[PDB]
Every structure is written in structure tokens, then in C-alpha cells.
């Protein structure tokens, strides 16, 4: 279900979010 898609965006988001962590 969405969970499959959820990990898809979550991986990408993790970078965007991670950038903040780094920033």
C-alpha cells in the first residue's frame, strides 16, 4: 500500500531533511 510509496519519498526526504541537520 502507501507504505511502499512512503519509503520511496522518505528516502529522498531524508536527504532534504538531513541537509537541514547538516545545515
From Swiss-Prot:
Q: Where in the cell is it found?
A: Secreted
Q: Which domain of life is it from?
A: Eukaryota
Name the UniProt record assigns to this protein: Clavanin-A
Q: Which UniProt keywords apply?
A: Amidation, Antibiotic, Antimicrobial, Secreted, Signal
Query: List-wise, which residues carry Phenylalanine amide?
Result: 23
Query: Could you confirm whether the keyword Signal appears in this record?
Result: yes
An example Gene Ontology cellular component term from the record? extracellular region
Q: What does this protein do?
A: Has antimicrobial activity.
Some GO term, biological process aspect, for this entry: which one?
defense response to bacterium
Q: Which organism is it from?
A: Styela clava
* Regions annotated as coiled coil: none
Amino acid at each position: 500500500v502507501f507504505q511502499f510509496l512512503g519509503k520511496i519519498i522518505h528516502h529522498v526526504g531524508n536527504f532534504v531533511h538531513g541537509f537541514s541537520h547538516v545545515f
